[PDB]
Design a protein around this ligand. Structure first.
Ligand SMILES: Nc1ncnc2c1ncn2[C@@H]1O[C@H](COP(=O)(O)OP(=O)(O)O)[C@@H](O)[C@H]1O
Length: 352
């Protein structure tokens, strides 16, 4: 690079994201010239946190990984960012336990007068291929190809079809978005500034079973986003389908020699440090008219480990008091333990 490292130091005054709160002159100077084997840089990692000083509805991380090696090469920034975002989980000293045994959720039925729908998602990355911030068009097509091939192996109620977004009409896309089945077009500046809207919709698509109760998003926010959902509040069956579907998807992918990005410190590796560990967001849509307008609601959400979101997701506000309520933490606690903290965390919200 053409200047001293410090000449490139970003202006982060009035930036309220984890990256800006952890970046120091020392860390920046030490990492500016380091690169991953695929050539991903620190400036690319942090660009979204530099360009986006806030967000209208949620606290942001302000950095993304371009590849698996980003988390090693830029550990001096990612590690304190991970600790800050995940309430003390420290990948330098701790390890993460994966647990997808659905039987340990023995009771799971919400009051259907208040809770409209129930959903469990995670993400998975394929090792050897760059993540969405950095992937070339050929890497991204390869991800689609590896995913497509594996998912044709799914049987029974998990049988489904892949739909390329390039071959889907605007009318069919918008329908699926309005019915909470398909991702929005990446217009969010968090995503665009991280390089995650490049070449859209090339190699993006949705795979789903006929009932739309097991869905997989390909190459939007991650390589894959694996989703289980339905109308109502039966979290116990939703999670049994999630665990069964996910274990099979893994086996089908592993059958051809691909591995998921994973290590013992970070659990499953994904684009954004907010989705590390389990990557798991178990949630419901809930009509909480009285509980929402109360001034102490934000304190009850942060203490119960839950996040608030709009009816149309992270970038929207609530409509008709219908709030998206799900677990805030994703690493340090297992998938089982996180589902349990959503079953309990909603019932406090249904009573209160
Ligand atoms: N519990 C839920 N029930 C029904 N739809 C949901 C639920 N949670 C999220 N969604 C839908 O998923 C889509 C993406 O929302 P987002 O907040 O980005 O969730 P995620 O990051 O888990 O994909 C939106 O269309 C949103 O309405």
């Amino acid at each position: 690079r053409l200047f001293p490292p410090s000449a490139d130091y970003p202006d982060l005054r009035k930036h309220n994201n984890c990256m800006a709160e952890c970046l120091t002159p020392a860390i920046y100077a030490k990492l500016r010239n380091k690169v991953t084997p695929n050539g991903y840089t620190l400036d690319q990692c942090i660009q979204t946190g530099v360009d986006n000083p806030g967000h209208p509805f949620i606290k942001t991380v302000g950095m993304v990984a371009g590849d698996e090696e980003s988390y090693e090469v830029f550990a001096d920034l990612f590690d304190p960012v991970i600790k800050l975002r995940h309430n003390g989980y420290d990948p330098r000293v701790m390890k993460h336990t994966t647990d997808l045994d659905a039987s340990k959720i023995t009771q799971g039925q919400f009051d259907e007068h208040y809770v409209l729908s129930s959903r469990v998602r995670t993400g998975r990355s394929i090792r050897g291929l760059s993540l969405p911030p950095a992937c070339t068009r050929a890497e991204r097509r390869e991800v689609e190809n590896v995913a497509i091939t594996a998912l044709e192996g799914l049987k029974g109620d998990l049988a489904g079809r892949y739909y390329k977004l390039s071959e889907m009409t605007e009318q069919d896309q918008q329908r699926l978005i309005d019915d909470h089945f398909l991702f929005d077009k990446p217009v969010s500046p968090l995503l665009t500034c991280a390089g995650m809207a490049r070449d859209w919709p090339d190699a993006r698509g949705i795979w789903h079973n006929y009932d739309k109760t097991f869905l997989i998003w390909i190459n939007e926010e991650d390589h894959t986003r694996v989703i289980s959902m339905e109308k109502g509040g039966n979290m116990k069956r939703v999670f049994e389908r999630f665990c069964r579907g996910l274990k099979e998807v893994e086996r089908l992918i592993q059958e051809r020699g691909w591995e998921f990005m994973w290590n013992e410190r970070l659990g499953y590796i994904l684009t954004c440090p907010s989705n590390l560990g389990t990557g798991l967001r178990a949630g419901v849509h809930v009509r909480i008219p009285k509980l929402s307008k109360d001034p102490r609601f934000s304190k009850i959400l942060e203490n119960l480990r839950l996040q608030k979101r709009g009816t149309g997701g992270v970038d929207t506000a609530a409509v008709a008091d219908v709030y998206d309520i799900s677990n805030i933490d994703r690493i340090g606690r297992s998938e089982v333990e996180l589902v349990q903290i959503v079953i309990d965390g909603v019932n406090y919200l249904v009573d209160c």
